[PDB]
Design a protein around this ligand. Sequence first.
Ligand SMILES: Nc1nc2c(ncn2[C@@H]2O[C@@H]3COP(=O)(O)O[C@H]4[C@@H](O)[C@H](n5cnc6c(=O)[nH]c(N)nc65)O[C@@H]4COP(=O)(O)O[C@H]3[C@H]2O)c(=O)[nH]1
Ligand SMILES: Nc1nc2c(ncn2[C@@H]2O[C@@H]3COP(=O)(O)O[C@H]4[C@@H](O)[C@H](n5cnc6c(=O)[nH]c(N)nc65)O[C@@H]4COP(=O)(O)O[C@H]3[C@H]2O)c(=O)[nH]1
Ligand SMILES: Nc1nc2c(ncn2[C@@H]2O[C@@H]3COP(=O)(O)O[C@H]4[C@@H](O)[C@H](n5cnc6c(=O)[nH]c(N)nc65)O[C@@H]4COP(=O)(O)O[C@H]3[C@H]2O)c(=O)[nH]1
Ligand SMILES: Nc1nc2c(ncn2[C@@H]2O[C@@H]3COP(=O)(O)O[C@H]4[C@@H](O)[C@H](n5cnc6c(=O)[nH]c(N)nc65)O[C@@H]4COP(=O)(O)O[C@H]3[C@H]2O)c(=O)[nH]1
Ligand SMILES: Nc1nc2c(ncn2[C@@H]2O[C@@H]3COP(=O)(O)O[C@H]4[C@@H](O)[C@H](n5cnc6c(=O)[nH]c(N)nc65)O[C@@H]4COP(=O)(O)O[C@H]3[C@H]2O)c(=O)[nH]1
Lengths: 171, 176
Amino acid sequence: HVRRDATTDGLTNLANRKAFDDELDRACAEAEEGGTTICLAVLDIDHFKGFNDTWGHQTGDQVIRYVASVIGRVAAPPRFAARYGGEEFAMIFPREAASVVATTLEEIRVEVSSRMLKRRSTNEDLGAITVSSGFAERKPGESGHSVMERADAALYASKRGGRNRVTAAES
Amino acid sequence: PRGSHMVRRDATTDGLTNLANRKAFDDELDRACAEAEEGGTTICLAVLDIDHFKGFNDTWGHQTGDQVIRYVASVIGRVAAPPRFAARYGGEEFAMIFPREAASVVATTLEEIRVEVSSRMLKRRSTNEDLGAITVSSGFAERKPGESGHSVMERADAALYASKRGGRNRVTAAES
Ligand SMILES: Nc1nc2c(ncn2[C@@H]2O[C@@H]3COP(=O)(O)O[C@H]4[C@@H](O)[C@H](n5cnc6c(=O)[nH]c(N)nc65)O[C@@H]4COP(=O)(O)O[C@H]3[C@H]2O)c(=O)[nH]1
Ligand SMILES: Nc1nc2c(ncn2[C@@H]2O[C@@H]3COP(=O)(O)O[C@H]4[C@@H](O)[C@H](n5cnc6c(=O)[nH]c(N)nc65)O[C@@H]4COP(=O)(O)O[C@H]3[C@H]2O)c(=O)[nH]1
Ligand SMILES: Nc1nc2c(ncn2[C@@H]2O[C@@H]3COP(=O)(O)O[C@H]4[C@@H](O)[C@H](n5cnc6c(=O)[nH]c(N)nc65)O[C@@H]4COP(=O)(O)O[C@H]3[C@H]2O)c(=O)[nH]1
Ligand SMILES: Nc1nc2c(ncn2[C@@H]2O[C@@H]3COP(=O)(O)O[C@H]4[C@@H](O)[C@H](n5cnc6c(=O)[nH]c(N)nc65)O[C@@H]4COP(=O)(O)O[C@H]3[C@H]2O)c(=O)[nH]1
Ligand SMILES: Nc1nc2c(ncn2[C@@H]2O[C@@H]3COP(=O)(O)O[C@H]4[C@@H](O)[C@H](n5cnc6c(=O)[nH]c(N)nc65)O[C@@H]4COP(=O)(O)O[C@H]3[C@H]2O)c(=O)[nH]1
């Protein structure tokens, strides 16, 4: 001298935060022109730093890949999923009712916690992996950043409720 | 919702860089140490740290942080052809084994890595902004005749702390 895709995340091959932010603005402007709905969810891996302290950074990477996999299998277009931060994922649900989004997030959290992952090196049990979740419907005049803040506030509510749960901003 | 068929990847490697991972390195260190005892041969161990690394992620985001991990890892991998052995050792640490090489060669090599990492200024793929200079700090130890892998690593890490306290962007031999 070939460059990797600058809009994807290396560990998971989902979109990265900046691609999600560009997609969010576009999706909001398009739901605003066509009078259609859009829902935003934010997910966080529970006790994630704990995994890295207990088991090592390599195993933390595999917990990210595990959860990213579950999310990706349920984010077929027109849905959009991204690795949003070190332990956070974000999803766009266009033209879907808020109760459908809640059912999808509840299905993600059941799936993630539904088997005991094992350490590849030693076969020790890692402990169950749970996930906390917050979603919000876009309001009529509302920008992507604003509805993202209402979804994050719901994620915080889920964390304060005791984690391993889904919370609608509209509650 | 069952996905298409895939194979487990090499679990001795690191995802971001495909150098070895901490657990593979630890076993390889014990093996190489035993071979150096029964062979009467020498062996050296360096440990490297990306300076100011959380600051990067705070200033530019996690994605950009990953690019710096891959850049520094590529510099290390160029000089780690077998019998040498490199690994992503922790989130921002690398480690290298130099079997049958003198401390003088390791010192010179780490000095080469240090200069190479800092030699150009990376730009973000997404916005073309200048990240600034990236440096690494570095410690290494020569294995003593009776010494286990763990105690060599302990001495090499203490050299690495010496470099960080020295002001970073430098190389310290444990024999000080
Ligand atoms: N999409 C794409 N574009 C490419 C590729 N290769 C070169 N370019 C474009 O050509 C410009 C000059 O590349 P260069 O002469 O190698 O000059 C490069 C090269 O000397 C160095 N550099 C940048 N990225 C890398 C890298 O990933 N690996 C290495 N080894 N050097 C790099 O930085 C200089 C400036 O890079 P840029 O400012 O990005 O500017 C780059 C970039 O805009 C490619 O594989 N894919
Ligand atoms: N001459 C030249 N070669 C290029 C250029 N872009 C890509 N390449 C080649 O393609 C490889 C893949 O780059 P990548 O996928 O961006 O993966 C890169 C990238 O993720 C990160 N990285 C390296 N340099 C830069 C940089 O200047 N800026 C950013 N943001 N990341 C970098 O480190 C990874 C490994 O880099 P390499 O070992 O250099 O390996 C690079 C390099 O050999 C270019 O503009 N000029
Ligand atoms: N770009 C990137 N940066 C990294 C990575 N590992 C560590 N860092 C950076 O180093 C800081 C300290 O991480 P830590 O002490 O390992 O403690 C970390 C570590 O336990 C874990 N963590 C964060 N990101 C990752 C990741 O990508 N992989 C893994 N396995 N763990 C991560 O969560 C803790 C909190 O992380 P932060 O608040 O984000 O702050 C992290 C982050 O800024 C990495 O693989 N990629
Ligand atoms: N039925 C079955 N399928 C297997 C097995 N090993 C590998 N696979 C398949 O190979 C894919 C890649 O596995 P990976 O590279 O370990 O990549 C994995 C790994 O990094 C992490 N992961 C998933 N399950 C575990 C686990 O039980 N332990 C650990 N340490 N990591 C896991 O999540 C990533 C994605 O996992 P998947 O989406 O399930 O995607 C997996 C799965 O489709 C197996 O023993 N049984
Ligand atoms: N190298 C390699 N080995 C493979 C692969 N697929 C299966 N094996 C081996 O076959 C054993 C049983 O696989 P299983 O019936 O899927 O039974 C697996 C599977 O139900 C689950 N599991 C483990 N890793 C994964 C994963 O990455 N993805 C999924 N979906 N399930 C996994 O845990 C059970 C126990 O797994 P282990 O104790 O690891 O034991 C695994 C592993 O030793 C592969 O793609 N690559």
